């Protein structure tokens, strides 16, 4: 199934290693209920998005290095990177830095990732999600 990253060095390497794809990280725990729902979505779309994105899972207990600076206080946090930069997206939720709930509609996440990919490749640090989750 989906690859996991097991320490800070591996996370830095995953982000450093993509010149032309968005790095998608799910911070949480495989055992957490919200994560399970989100992981299933991520697994289901991974093949589909393979051309513009790669997805990793990070257990924030095994790998706590980022908990404070990325404010990983929600049970489930999905964040995006492109060429070693954190990419923000306006979801209309009041937090443009992360997707912090189990999105269960698979195609919505495909489209968000696509949006992040085009926007970031165009040099944007901030993109806007097609659907408004306010």
């Amino acid at each position: 199934m989906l690859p996991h990253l097991h320490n800070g060095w591996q996370v830095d390497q995953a982000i450093l290693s993509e010149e032309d794809r968005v790095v998608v990280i799910r911070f949480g725990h495989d055992w957490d209920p919200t994560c399970m729902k989100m992981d299933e979505v991520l697994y289901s779309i991974a093949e589909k998005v393979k051309n513009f994105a790669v997805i990793y899972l990070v257990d924030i207990t095994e790998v706590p290095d980022f908990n404070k600076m990325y404010e990983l206080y929600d049970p489930c946090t999905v964040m995006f990177f492109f060429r070693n930069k954190h990419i923000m997206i306006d979801l209309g939720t009041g937090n443009n830095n992360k997707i912090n709930w189990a999105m269960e509609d698979k195609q919505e996440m495909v489209d968000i990732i696509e949006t992040v990919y085009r926007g970031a490749r165009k040099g944007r640090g901030l993109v806007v999600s097609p659907k408004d989750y306010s």
Partner: peptide
Amino acid sequence: PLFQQRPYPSPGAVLRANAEASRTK
């Protein structure tokens, strides 16, 4: 939007920030 959210640092920048804090401490 006054006081707008800023992006987080790269994972490399965070690991570095963490390493610096241990140096000082």
